[PDB]
Design a protein around this nucleic acid. Sequence first.
RNA 1: GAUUCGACGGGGACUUCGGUCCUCGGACGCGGGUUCGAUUCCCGC
Length: 125
Amino acid sequence: SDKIIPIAENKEAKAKYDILETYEAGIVLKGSEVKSLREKGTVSFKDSFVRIENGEAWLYNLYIAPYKHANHDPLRKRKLLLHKREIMRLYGKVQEKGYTIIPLKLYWKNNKVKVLIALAKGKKL
RNA sequence: GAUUCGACGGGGACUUCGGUCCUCGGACGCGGGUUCGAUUCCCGC
C-alpha cells in the first residue's frame, strides 16, 4: 500500500529532544537535489532547524550533496508542504510553551521525497 | 505508472462570509514541445 525507502535519519536528535508530536514532510526540492538524493549523495542534519516565516514552514540548514549537473547552495531555506492548520498549530506551541521544531528524517514515499518533522522539548540531562 | 495529502503561485466553484473545496504548475541536469497522461518519447543548451 505505502512503499517507503529511508534516506537519512537524525541520530544527533534522538538523545537530545524528547518528541512531543511528529508530522510528515512535504518539501519543494530543486531538480538537481532530487537526482543527487537518488544518486545516493551525502546529507546531514547538523545544526539543522525549522522556522515558520510568513505563514510558511522552512527547513533551514540541511546539507544535500550536489552532483555533476553543472548554483544549488547545499543549505537553501527549503520550504515545507504542510497544511496551514498544521503550521498554525506548530507555530502556536512554539510560542505558548517555547518548544522547538526539528527534522527527524528524510525518506522516499512513492518516489516523493519527504522529511519527518517533530515538535520537541529539551532533556535537561 | 493520476499523485509533493499540504505551502506557494495561476484559474474556478459553493457559502448566514466566518467557512468548505476543485484544478493547473512544481523535484528527478536547464529551459521547452508532443500526448488524455508522462522523472522513462521528441527539440535546443
